[PDB]
Design a protein around this nucleic acid. Structure first.
Ligand code: ZN
Ligand code: ZN
Length: 55
RNA sequence: GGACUAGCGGAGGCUAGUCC
């Protein structure tokens, strides 16, 4: 238990850290970062991918 | 508060509902 919100995993939540699917940044082993899982630039995000569209 | 169901999210919170 502890953190029922974790149930979000029931929707193959996406890791906002690495940008994978199956775990969240919270449950992400990687350190708290902000590397666009699109271009690989640390600072911006996919939503604001200054490289290319967001799928 | 908890747990679910939902739902979205670059941030995981929020609410509702039911239960006490
Ligand atoms: Zn991750
Ligand atoms: Zn980018």
């Amino acid at each position: 238990m502890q953190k029922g919100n974790f149930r979000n995993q029931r929707k193959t939540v996406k890791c906002f850290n690495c940008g994978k699917e199956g775990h969240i940044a919270k449950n992400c082993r990687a350190p708290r970062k902000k590397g666009c899982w699109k271009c690989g630039k640390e600072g911006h995000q996919m939503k604001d991918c200054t490289e290319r569209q967001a799928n």
